Symmetry: C3
Subunit: 332 residues, 3 copies
């Protein structure tokens, strides 16, 4: 009887940060209660000032990472305030039935709903809006995130030994399709209905105009670079709700990678780059061995360095000259 | 001596259905005899009435699924009737030598040929036409299918335990490249030779105009939706002869997935989405747990919902409120 | 103390050939010394005579395959002669720290540098140039290769048994983005600086104009076809520094494949086609069973047969009619 289970309310945080949780479950199964408020908002996505009408869960692109354990129940209160204009819903790839919840969560502006589902499979999973007839438009306007369902005994390596992370980050990668005129400049629009056919035309090109981490070019850089220390074990969850990506840590590796995100499978070891298919979340575990700046990229390097799919880690600590050294510095 | 082996004649069926077979081999190795007749035909591929000149094995896009067991011999009689205009052949990715058979099976209109090969590797494999100098044109005109080579003791899970499906479906996904003029409308053509250079130009864009299951937008919907019941174990074989795809069952999972289709490998567990590379067939096994409508899609959602790569399952049975429920239905 | 280790100087060879090495390490850890000289040069990449300004390591696209064992040190002397015009560097995906070495290896024309790093992870890995602000331009101008870090006890299969190759080839696959005018003809340019913005524009299309093996359409054909004999065990290392590929041996298989290239993982068995993500090297092992011509392709068949991503094997030996035969040759 679900009513006899503990309830715990989670307060979500903005990506790339992740709400506090325990890797190894410290309680039995629980109903884990989340609330998200949909926000349609203008977002500047590049250094040129290109502004789009984003559709968000909780104000961010991506939406926040939710974290539960296997066989917990996820109870989500989804709020669509009357300041929004569109119908929205939510589909969890972690859930079973009713189009992942989408069939049960259609909320007009001024409405809310509560969905409960049992998290029966461990892994990282995409969630996204998916209103009938409008699915890719909502998803490619930012309106996707991820949920991590941890095994109750935490992560394990390929031999069944524990893998415990010290830090976790969530990198949502977003493909945008900003409509272009025949000279190639972006268009804007006066209403969502007036934008819709050219959004469809732009999407049909299958060529994103921007591919960004955490909602904008450069979002994971400078003061907002990811951080770690030498010797820290870091889990990076990476999702892409619509298009393949190939993450790579420049100067590092994925020591243990679940490229398609499902923890019942043994991880792939020692990866340089891995393929996360569109519509999937993946997770990579790495122990830093060197300080300095790293770039975390989609290793289509055009996508990374021209379209925006690049962020930075700043890592503190001691340099290891055994691992790498300049024997002769550049010189004439 | 192959002449001492039993022969069995298979009568093929139209996708997404699959000819009757046994999962666990009930006989020793056999020569399994198949016949396919090539048909060049007009096909309407979308709701707008866009009509192409399709090139088919057995009248369908995809061609039918052939099913044998490991170390059977596949004997195919391939017929190119004189009502066709082009040279065709067949290449089996399951076979070894002679470009998969393509070098031995070149048939002008009015010709036939018989090829035999030993199915030495278990898995699902693409087959496709591949005439020298014209390969992608034939393949992207529909002229591909798949063959399943079952292990003699049937499918097994990651622990070596049997996996037995109750139903099997074959979803062939087809990328079409319908030539467009500079305003973006499709062109038609008066002969294959007159179409060829613009087919090549259209293909060179690397941007399909349509991506469909079972030969047309909506083919696997309505009266032709896939069906199952709660508790049924379903195997979905999915092929793509030319371009990557990322299947996903909306509201479900791939409980056991051979993404690259080869049964000697342990399956990946609990997949949300999986990557089937172009030129591969994959297979996913799922036990339905909830009734209702599911969408089975390529989870590039633009490809699914704008270009055609979406079908439906209709599932009968009892709803499980433990797995999912609406706690509070959408309301003001 | 690294100075107490043996040093061995390797003399590199042009792809697709690979410098001599031992699969099982015959010495303890060593410092393996390599030298590469950067060459900017004109290269004709297609049958039409399209000529680009290539950026190369050691005069070739791809750069040469380097081979070491796990826990060897790689010491590379990188020379940028004063006959070049651009700044270059090198990033090894095999290395840890300093952006794979790129932060330590920036060489103006007329400069050289020496980098040492410990090869701590076994596998095949990409290396590429990556000058800050110019990364995809250099990589997509050819300026990438691979390094193989063998386990000290050589390759092993999924059961831990040895896999020993008789021959090894390195296929580098290169995506080029040759700028096109509005009629679709290639442009040329008078200086690298004058080419840069249109190179960026061309790259931003995400649509390669050419995808080639060993630097040009047809490079691995005719007198330069790959060769083998029936019964030979062949390892094909395949890299793609920027874009996904899906190799396939037409008429054969990948008997053992490390699609993402890392030897600590068990190989995938019996592959028809496999996905090597952009920014990765993979490796496939096959034992030839039939003589004749094979095509080795990227199985996006448009990429293979229209854009250039196809080569040939010529295999000598005895035909096996048990594996494949023409029962009835094509006839009326
Ligand atoms: O707890 N049954 O999924
Ligand atoms: O943090 N425990 O390994
Ligand atoms: O055609 N101008 O969007
Ligand atoms: O091209 N990725 O969906
Ligand atoms: O199939 N491209 O997303
Ligand atoms: O989904 N397993 O990485
Ligand atoms: O039966 N030998 O492949
Ligand atoms: O249908 N036997 O599990
Ligand atoms: O340029 N009209 O196909
Ligand atoms: O983009 N798939 O071949
Ligand atoms: O590489 N795209 O099929
Ligand atoms: O090919 N193994 O999924
Ligand atoms: O030898 N330590 O990587
Ligand atoms: O070449 N030894 O298997
Ligand atoms: O617009 N001509 O490159
Ligand atoms: O489409 N491959 O990066
Ligand atoms: O994501 N295409 O390389
Ligand atoms: O990276 N393992 O193929
Ligand atoms: Cu929405
Ligand atoms: Cu989805
Ligand atoms: Cu044909
Ligand atoms: Cu093929
Ligand atoms: Cu360079
Ligand atoms: Cu790189």
């Amino acid at each position: 009887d679900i009513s006899t289970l503990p309830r715990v309310k989670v307060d979500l945080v903005k990506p790339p940060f992740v709400h506090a949780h325990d890797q190894v479950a410290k309680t039995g199964p629980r109903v884990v209660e989340f609330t998200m408020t949909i926000e349609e908002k203008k977002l500047v996505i590049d250094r040129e000032g290109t502004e789009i009408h984003a559709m968000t869960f909780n104000g961010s692109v991506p939406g926040p990472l939710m974290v539960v354990h296997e066989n917990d129940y996820v109870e989500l209160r989804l709020i669509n305030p009357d300041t929004n204009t569109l119908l929205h819903n939510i589909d969890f790839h972690a859930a079973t039935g009713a189009l992942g919840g989408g069939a049960l969560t259609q909320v007009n502006p001024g409405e809310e709903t509560t969905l409960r589902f049992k998290a029966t499979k461990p892994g990282v999973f995409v969630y996204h809006c998916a209103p009938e007839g409008m699915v890719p438009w909502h998803v490619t306007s930012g309106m996707n995130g991820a949920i991590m369902v941890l095994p109750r005994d935490g992560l394990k390596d390929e031999k069944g030994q524990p893998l415990t992370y010290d830090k976790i980050y969530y990198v949502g990668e977003q493909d945008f399709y900003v409509p272009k005129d025949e000279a190639g400049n972006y268009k804007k629009y006066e209403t969502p209905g007036e934008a819709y056919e050219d959004a469809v035309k732009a999407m049909r090109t299958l060529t994103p105009t921007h591919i960004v981490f955490n909602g904008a070019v450069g979002a994971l850089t400078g003061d907002h670079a990811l951080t770690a220390a030498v010797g820290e074990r870091v889990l990076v969850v990476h999702s892409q709700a619509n298009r393949d990506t190939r993450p790579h840590l420049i100067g590092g590796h994925g020591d243990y990678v679940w490229a398609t995100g499902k923890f019942r499978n043994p991880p792939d070891l020692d990866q340089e780059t891995w393929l996360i298919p569109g519509g999937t979340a993946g997770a990579a575990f790495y122990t830093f061995r060197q300080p300095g700046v790293y770039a975390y990229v989609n290793h289509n390097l055009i996508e990374a360095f021209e379209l925006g799919a690049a962020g930075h880690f700043k890592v503190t600590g001691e340099w290891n000259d055994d691992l790498m050294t300049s024997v002769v510095k550049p010189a004439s």
